[PDB]
Coordinates of all heavy atoms in Angstrom, one line a residue:
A24 N -25.6 -7.9 10.8 CA -25.0 -6.7 10.1 C -24.7 -7.1 8.7 O -24.5 -8.3 8.4 CB -23.8 -6.2 10.9
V25 N -24.5 -6.1 7.9 CA -24.1 -6.3 6.5 C -22.6 -6.6 6.6 O -21.8 -5.8 7.1 CB -24.3 -5.1 5.6 CG1 -23.8 -5.3 4.2 CG2 -25.8 -4.8 5.5
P26 N -22.2 -7.8 6.2 CA -20.7 -8.2 6.2 C -19.9 -7.1 5.6 O -20.2 -6.6 4.5 CB -20.7 -9.5 5.5 CG -22.0 -10.1 5.7 CD -23.0 -8.9 5.6
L27 N -18.8 -6.8 6.2 CA -18.0 -5.6 5.8 C -17.3 -5.9 4.4 O -16.8 -7.0 4.2 CB -16.9 -5.3 6.8 CG -17.4 -4.8 8.1 CD1 -16.2 -4.4 9.0 CD2 -18.3 -3.6 7.9
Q28 N -17.4 -5.0 3.5 CA -16.8 -5.0 2.2 C -15.6 -4.1 2.1 O -15.6 -3.1 2.8 CB -17.9 -4.6 1.1 CG -19.1 -5.5 1.1 CD -18.8 -7.0 0.9 OE1 -18.2 -7.3 -0.1 NE2 -19.3 -7.8 1.8
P29 N -14.6 -4.4 1.3 CA -13.5 -3.6 1.2 C -13.9 -2.2 0.7 O -14.6 -2.0 -0.2 CB -12.6 -4.3 0.1 CG -13.0 -5.7 0.2 CD -14.5 -5.7 0.5
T30 N -13.4 -1.1 1.4 CA -13.7 0.2 1.1 C -12.9 0.7 -0.2 O -11.9 0.1 -0.5 CB -13.4 1.2 2.3 OG1 -12.0 1.1 2.6 CG2 -14.2 0.8 3.5
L31 N -13.5 1.7 -0.8 CA -12.8 2.3 -2.0 C -11.4 2.8 -1.6 O -10.5 2.7 -2.3 CB -13.7 3.4 -2.6 CG -13.1 4.2 -3.8 CD1 -13.0 3.3 -5.0 CD2 -14.1 5.3 -4.1
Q32 N -11.3 3.5 -0.4 CA -10.1 4.0 0.1 C -9.0 3.0 0.1 O -7.9 3.2 -0.3 CB -10.3 4.7 1.4 CG -9.1 5.4 2.0 CD -9.4 6.4 3.0 OE1 -10.1 7.4 2.8 NE2 -8.9 6.2 4.3
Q33 N -9.3 1.8 0.7 CA -8.4 0.7 0.8 C -7.8 0.3 -0.5 O -6.6 0.1 -0.7 CB -9.0 -0.5 1.5 CG -9.0 -0.5 3.0 CD -9.9 -1.5 3.6 OE1 -11.0 -1.8 3.1 NE2 -9.5 -2.1 4.7
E34 N -8.7 0.2 -1.5 CA -8.3 -0.2 -2.8 C -7.5 0.8 -3.6 O -6.5 0.5 -4.2 CB -9.5 -0.7 -3.7 CG -10.4 -1.7 -2.9 CD -11.5 -2.3 -3.8 OE1 -12.6 -1.8 -3.8 OE2 -11.2 -3.3 -4.5
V35 N -7.8 2.1 -3.5 CA -7.0 3.1 -4.1 C -5.6 3.1 -3.4 O -4.6 3.3 -4.1 CB -7.7 4.5 -4.1 CG1 -9.1 4.4 -4.6 CG2 -7.7 5.1 -2.7
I36 N -5.6 3.0 -2.1 CA -4.3 3.0 -1.4 C -3.5 1.8 -1.8 O -2.3 1.9 -2.1 CB -4.5 3.0 0.1 CG1 -5.2 4.3 0.5 CG2 -3.2 2.8 0.8 CD1 -4.3 5.5 0.2
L37 N -4.1 0.6 -2.0 CA -3.4 -0.6 -2.4 C -2.8 -0.5 -3.8 O -1.7 -0.9 -4.1 CB -4.3 -1.8 -2.2 CG -3.6 -3.1 -1.9 CD1 -2.7 -3.0 -0.7 CD2 -4.7 -4.2 -1.6
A38 N -3.6 0.1 -4.7 CA -3.2 0.3 -6.1 C -2.0 1.3 -6.1 O -1.0 1.0 -6.8 CB -4.3 0.9 -6.9
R39 N -2.1 2.4 -5.5 CA -1.0 3.3 -5.4 C 0.3 2.7 -4.8 O 1.4 3.0 -5.2 CB -1.3 4.7 -4.8 CG -0.3 5.7 -5.0 CD 0.0 5.8 -6.5 NE 1.1 6.6 -6.8 CZ 1.1 7.9 -7.2 NH1 -0.1 8.5 -7.3 NH2 2.2 8.6 -7.5
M40 N 0.1 1.9 -3.8 CA 1.2 1.2 -3.2 C 1.9 0.3 -4.1 O 3.1 0.2 -4.2 CB 0.8 0.4 -1.9 CG 0.5 1.3 -0.7 SD -0.1 0.3 0.7 CE 0.0 1.5 2.0
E41 N 1.1 -0.5 -4.9 CA 1.7 -1.3 -6.0 C 2.5 -0.5 -6.9 O 3.6 -0.8 -7.3 CB 0.6 -2.1 -6.7 CG 1.1 -3.1 -7.7 CD 0.0 -3.7 -8.6 OE1 -1.1 -3.2 -8.5 OE2 0.3 -4.6 -9.3
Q42 N 1.9 0.7 -7.3 CA 2.6 1.6 -8.3 C 3.9 2.1 -7.7 O 4.9 2.1 -8.4 CB 1.7 2.7 -8.6 CG 0.5 2.4 -9.6 CD -0.2 3.6 -10.0 OE1 0.0 4.7 -9.6 NE2 -1.2 3.4 -11.0
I43 N 3.9 2.5 -6.4 CA 5.1 3.1 -5.8 C 6.2 2.0 -5.7 O 7.3 2.2 -6.0 CB 4.8 3.7 -4.5 CG1 3.8 4.9 -4.7 CG2 6.0 4.2 -3.8 CD1 4.3 5.9 -5.7
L44 N 5.8 0.8 -5.1 CA 6.8 -0.2 -5.0 C 7.3 -0.7 -6.3 O 8.4 -1.2 -6.4 CB 6.2 -1.4 -4.2 CG 5.9 -1.2 -2.7 CD1 5.2 -2.4 -2.2 CD2 7.2 -1.0 -2.0
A45 N 6.5 -0.5 -7.4 CA 7.0 -0.8 -8.7 C 8.2 0.0 -9.1 O 9.1 -0.5 -9.8 CB 5.9 -0.7 -9.8
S46 N 8.2 1.3 -8.7 CA 9.3 2.2 -9.1 C 10.6 1.8 -8.3 O 10.5 1.2 -7.2 CB 8.9 3.6 -8.8 OG 9.1 4.0 -7.4
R47 N 11.7 2.2 -8.8 CA 13.0 2.0 -8.2 C 13.4 3.1 -7.2 O 14.1 2.8 -6.2 CB 14.1 1.8 -9.3 CG 15.5 1.7 -8.7 CD 15.6 0.5 -7.7 NE 16.9 0.5 -7.1 CZ 17.2 -0.2 -6.0 NH1 16.3 -1.0 -5.4 NH2 18.4 -0.2 -5.5
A48 N 12.9 4.3 -7.5 CA 13.3 5.5 -6.7 C 12.6 5.4 -5.3 O 11.6 5.9 -5.0 CB 12.8 6.8 -7.4
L49 N 13.3 4.6 -4.4 CA 12.9 4.4 -3.0 C 14.0 3.9 -2.2 O 14.7 2.9 -2.6 CB 11.7 3.4 -3.0 CG 10.3 4.0 -2.9 CD1 9.3 2.8 -2.6 CD2 10.2 5.1 -1.8
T50 N 14.3 4.5 -1.1 CA 15.3 4.0 -0.2 C 14.9 2.7 0.5 O 13.8 2.3 0.4 CB 15.6 5.1 0.9 OG1 14.5 5.2 1.8 CG2 15.8 6.5 0.3
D51 N 15.8 2.1 1.2 CA 15.5 0.9 1.9 C 14.6 1.1 3.1 O 13.7 0.3 3.4 CB 16.8 0.1 2.3 CG 17.4 -0.6 1.1 OD1 16.8 -0.7 0.0 OD2 18.5 -1.2 1.3
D52 N 14.8 2.2 3.8 CA 14.0 2.5 5.0 C 12.5 2.8 4.5 O 11.6 2.3 5.1 CB 14.5 3.7 5.7 CG 15.7 3.3 6.7 OD1 16.2 2.2 6.5 OD2 16.0 4.1 7.5
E53 N 12.4 3.6 3.5 CA 11.1 3.9 2.9 C 10.5 2.6 2.3 O 9.2 2.5 2.4 CB 11.2 5.0 1.8 CG 11.6 6.3 2.4 CD 12.0 7.3 1.3 OE1 12.5 6.9 0.3 OE2 11.7 8.6 1.5
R54 N 11.3 1.8 1.7 CA 10.7 0.5 1.2 C 10.2 -0.4 2.3 O 9.1 -0.9 2.1 CB 11.8 -0.2 0.4 CG 11.3 -1.5 -0.3 CD 12.2 -1.9 -1.5 NE 12.2 -0.9 -2.6 CZ 11.3 -1.0 -3.6 NH1 10.4 -1.9 -3.7 NH2 11.4 -0.1 -4.5
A55 N 10.9 -0.5 3.4 CA 10.5 -1.3 4.5 C 9.2 -0.7 5.1 O 8.3 -1.5 5.5 CB 11.6 -1.5 5.5
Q56 N 9.2 0.6 5.2 CA 8.0 1.3 5.7 C 6.8 1.0 4.9 O 5.7 0.6 5.4 CB 8.2 2.8 5.8 CG 7.0 3.6 6.0 CD 6.5 3.6 7.5 OE1 7.2 3.2 8.4 NE2 5.3 4.1 7.7
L57 N 6.9 1.1 3.5 CA 5.8 0.9 2.6 C 5.4 -0.6 2.7 O 4.2 -0.9 2.6 CB 6.1 1.3 1.2 CG 4.9 1.5 0.3 CD1 4.0 2.5 0.9 CD2 5.4 2.0 -1.1
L58 N 6.4 -1.5 2.8 CA 6.0 -2.9 2.9 C 5.2 -3.2 4.1 O 4.3 -4.0 4.1 CB 7.3 -3.7 2.8 CG 7.9 -4.0 1.5 CD1 9.3 -4.7 1.6 CD2 7.0 -4.7 0.6
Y59 N 5.6 -2.6 5.2 CA 4.9 -2.8 6.5 C 3.5 -2.2 6.4 O 2.5 -2.9 6.8 CB 5.6 -2.2 7.6 CG 4.8 -2.0 8.9 CD1 4.5 -3.2 9.7 CD2 4.3 -0.8 9.3 CE1 3.7 -3.1 10.8 CE2 3.5 -0.7 10.5 CZ 3.3 -1.8 11.2 OH 2.5 -1.7 12.4
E60 N 3.3 -1.1 5.7 CA 2.0 -0.5 5.6 C 1.1 -1.3 4.7 O -0.1 -1.5 4.9 CB 2.1 1.0 5.1 CG 2.8 1.9 6.0 CD 2.0 2.1 7.3 OE1 0.7 1.9 7.3 OE2 2.6 2.5 8.3
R61 N 1.7 -1.8 3.6 CA 0.9 -2.7 2.6 C 0.6 -4.0 3.3 O -0.5 -4.5 3.1 CB 1.7 -2.9 1.4 CG 0.9 -3.4 0.2 CD 1.6 -3.4 -1.1 NE 2.7 -4.4 -1.2 CZ 2.6 -5.4 -2.1 NH1 1.6 -5.6 -2.9 NH2 3.6 -6.3 -2.1
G62 N 1.4 -4.6 4.1 CA 1.1 -5.7 4.9 C -0.1 -5.5 5.9 O -1.0 -6.3 6.0
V63 N 0.0 -4.3 6.5 CA -1.1 -3.9 7.4 C -2.4 -3.8 6.6 O -3.5 -4.3 7.1 CB -0.8 -2.6 8.1 CG1 -2.0 -1.9 8.6 CG2 0.2 -2.8 9.2

């Protein structure tokens, strides 16, 4: 098979996650949620 390459969706999501975590306007629960999603 063609070895799997990172999808465009993954990269847009990761970029926006970096952007969101960069901002301060985030609770601790939402921050831990986003950290878990970005780790996933």
